[PDB]
Amino acid sequence: ASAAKGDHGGTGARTWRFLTFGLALPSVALCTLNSWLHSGHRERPAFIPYHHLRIRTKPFSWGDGNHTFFHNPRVNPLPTGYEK
């Protein structure tokens, strides 16, 4: 493709700034809008003690060794059902 805009023969930093402010950052703004606009917590997944999940072959080297690094009791259960 060639996108759909226009330029290529008035080239330099000017053009690239024009893109930074006229396209790139507005794209980041729209996506930031969309995202902070499907938020609000999703109902947490009913625990099932599947044997192919919450794998413990050796204690983690921290905490009680049953808690992973970015553990969130809101959504991440331990091997024996959710916390409190």
Binding site: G12, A13, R14, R17
Partner: protein, 98 residues
């Protein structure tokens, strides 16, 4: 987007980098970045080999596209020739470091 305030090399390049730049300007290669252009390599018009010392390894590539360079020390004084093809070489010490 053309304000100013970024230095140029002319302005702020120093050390050996600078001397290379300043040389390049005049048309001189003190630090051997360009390949030397050959001559006829006869007794009359030998290949002038700049050195600083009294000797310097010449490498001869006797026929363009030979895969084997012929190596030998060129000494100060009289024009020596390549063992393979007998093209002539003369050491021309000094200049370089003024």
């Amino acid at each position: 987007a053309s304000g100013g305030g970024v230095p140029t090399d002319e302005e702020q390049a120093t050390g050996l980098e600078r001397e290379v730049m300043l040389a390049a300007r005049k048309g001189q290669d003190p630090y051997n970045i360009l390949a030397p252009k050959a001559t006829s390599g006869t007794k009359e018009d030998p290949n002038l080999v700049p050195s600083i010392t009294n000797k310097r390894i010449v490498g001869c590539i006797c026929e363009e596209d030979n895969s084997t360079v012929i190596w030998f020390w060129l000494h100060k004084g009289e024009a020596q020739r390549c063992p393979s093809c007998g093209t002539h070489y003369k050491l021309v010490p000094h200049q370089l470091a003024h």
